Amino acid sequence: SSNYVLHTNDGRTIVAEGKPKVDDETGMISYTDAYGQQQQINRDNVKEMAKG
Amino acid sequence: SSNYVLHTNDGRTIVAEGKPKVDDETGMISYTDAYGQQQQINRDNVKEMAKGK
Amino acid sequence: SSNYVLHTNDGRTIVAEGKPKVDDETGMISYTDAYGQQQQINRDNVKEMAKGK
Amino acid sequence: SSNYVLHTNDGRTIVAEGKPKVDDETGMISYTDAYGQQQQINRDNVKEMAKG
Amino acid sequence: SSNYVLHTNDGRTIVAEGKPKVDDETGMISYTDAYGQQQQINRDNVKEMAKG
Amino acid sequence: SSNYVLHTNDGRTIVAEGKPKVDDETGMISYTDAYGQQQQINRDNVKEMAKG
Amino acid sequence: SSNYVLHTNDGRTIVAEGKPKVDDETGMISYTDAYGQQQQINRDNVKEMAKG
């Protein structure tokens, strides 16, 4: 898939390898960063998301 | 479909191609912008929107 | 149709034609303004609502 | 009638004729004021409520 | 029965006759005070509760 | 019952006998302290909890 | 069998032995720390989480 770009509410821009989605087991937004590591972020700190 | 205009708490005015709707797998408001890029925005960052303008 | 007046948390009063209601597709309060335009407003920005003119 | 008084965030004391209740269509607390007009107030703006 | 004491976020303690419970019609915490009068308070204004 | 140690957001430590859990009737975290008193605390004021 | 790292609001970097998950009884994020102790932390207090 194409990369996705997340904009945090703390001024950061994060690249994800695929579409970030809520992990029903944690309630947080799960994604894979550019280094291929699985990450999760509090949804309250995610302002926007763009495909590409 | 008629475009919608969203106003964010950040002061931005954003144009969507169709009615923005919550995406069940993200919990955020999903839409496609005027440029055709698929975007999502936290509902807490949306102040209001209108159908057309 | 009965009109409503929405009072926002930012000092605005908006006239609605028909009772504003939560739109499950967006999670925001949906209504039609005095000009026939469909609008949506974040529930957190709605302080009170009065039925009438 | 059953008379209630709502105490709001901004310090107001509002008289309601009949028990105020959430309107599931709006998610807000619905009530009839001392003048017979139907009112609705955001739940987050209501601090306390009392019969009297 | 037994009394309960509620501690609000505004530095106040209210005595309740019986266990306060959410009134599903209002979404607030419902209880009967010492005066035997029906009272309701926004859950966001309740810090703690104790059974006396 | 096994003890649990709760830490509030305002920096206090509270010992519970038995696992604290949400009381569906109040929406708050319910527990019995080490001294046998039934208490409840607003979830928003609970930072963390540890078994032991 | 991979470990996880939780980043909290107060700048803590907590190692979890296993993927943290919400506990339906408390509504908080449940996990086991490096010392084998069962811990729980308010979702609102977790900024991010990383696998590795």
Automatic annotation (TrEMBL), chains A, D, E, F, G:
Which residues are in the Lipoprotein YgdI/YgdR-like SH3-like domain?
3-50
Name the UniProt key words of this record, in alphabetical order: Cell membrane, Lipoprotein, Membrane, Palmitate, Signal
Q: Which domain of life is it from?
A: Bacteria
Regions that span the bilayer: none
Would you tell me the protein name for this molecule?
Answer: Lipoprotein
Full-protein residues shown here are 21 to 72 of 73
